[PDB]
From Swiss-Prot:
<keyword id="KW-0574">Periplasm</keyword>
<dbReference type="InterPro" id="IPR017937">
    <property type="entry name" value="Thioredoxin_CS"/>
</dbReference>
<dbReference type="InterPro" id="IPR050824">
    <property type="entry name" value="Thiol_disulfide_DsbA"/>
</dbReference>
<keyword id="KW-0732">Signal</keyword>
<dbReference type="GO" id="GO:0015035">
    <property type="term" value="F:protein-disulfide reductase activity"/>
</dbReference>
<dbReference type="InterPro" id="IPR036249">
    <property type="entry name" value="Thioredoxin-like_sf"/>
</dbReference>
<dbReference type="GO" id="GO:0071236">
    <property type="term" value="P:cellular response to antibiotic"/>
</dbReference>
<dbReference type="InterPro" id="IPR013766">
    <property type="entry name" value="Thioredoxin_domain"/>
</dbReference>
<keyword id="KW-0676">Redox-active center</keyword>
<keyword id="KW-1015">Disulfide bond</keyword>
<feature type="disulfide bond" description="Redox-active">
    <location>
        <begin position="33"/>
        <end position="36"/>
    </location>
</feature>
<comment type="similarity">
    <text>Belongs to the thioredoxin family. DsbA subfamily.</text>
</comment>
<dbReference type="GO" id="GO:0003756">
    <property type="term" value="F:protein disulfide isomerase activity"/>
</dbReference>
<dbReference type="GO" id="GO:0030288">
    <property type="term" value="C:outer membrane-bounded periplasmic space"/>
</dbReference>
<protein>
    <recommendedName>
        <fullName>Thiol:disulfide interchange protein DsbA</fullName>
    </recommendedName>
</protein>
<dbReference type="InterPro" id="IPR023205">
    <property type="entry name" value="DsbA/DsbL"/>
</dbReference>
<dbReference type="Pfam" id="PF01323">
    <property type="entry name" value="DSBA"/>
</dbReference>
């Protein structure tokens, strides 16, 4: 059994969830984060097997500079509806192929090779709608009081990471435990 204050903490000010009625699981990440890249083989298959009442979401940590730029790329891909399909390839480009993907022109030229419309990528990247999603994501990370990645937050209420949980497998087992806690809770 896990212990509040040890493997996870409870946020004294819970944060609203992106999809009311589902148990939210957020992974805060940065595409350029090696620990984030390394966790992917653990969290990806798990995330695809979650039940119908769970909503898994990735949230880019907008902690400045290149993190903001890569987060803006993430959010642009989500808007275009293609992030899932090019997700692994972005991680691979950054960590294996030496691609910096540090400007929208560079991102668009890379993503074109993965099927992504460059004009639509560029227009979405610079859109007002993306500005709002950026601020939303910033304010969420501030409200979760997250100061590094990868970090998990369940149902806007419980924050934990690989170190606190005690390893990558433990991170998912803890998430499972916390999902069950929320499923059992009175509505």
């Amino acid at each position: 059994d896990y212990t509040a204050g040890k493997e996870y903490v409870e946020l004294s000010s819970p944060v609203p969830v992106s999809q009311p009625g589902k148990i939210e699981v957020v992974e805060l990440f940065w595409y350029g984060c090696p620990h984030c890249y390394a966790f992917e083989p653990t969290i990806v298959p798990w995330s695809e097997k979650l039940p119908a009442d769970v909503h898994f979401v990735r949230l880019p940590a907008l902690f400045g500079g290149i993190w903001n730029v890569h987060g803006q790329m993430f959010l642009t891909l989500i808007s275009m509806g293609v992030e899932h399909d090019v997700h692994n390839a972005v991680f691979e480009a950054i960590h294996k192929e030496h691609k910096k993907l540090a400007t929208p022109e560079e991102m668009a030229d890379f993503l074109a090779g993965k099927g992504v419309d460059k004009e639509k990528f560029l227009s979405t990247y610079n859109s007002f709608a993306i500005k709002g999603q950026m601020e939303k994501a910033k304010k969420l990370a501030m409200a979760y009081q997250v100061t590094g990645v990868p970090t998990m937050v369940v149902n806007g209420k419980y924050r934990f990471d690989i170190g606190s949980a005690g390893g990558p497998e433990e991170t998912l087992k803890l998430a499972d435990y916390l999902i069950e806690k929320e499923r059992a809770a009175a509505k």
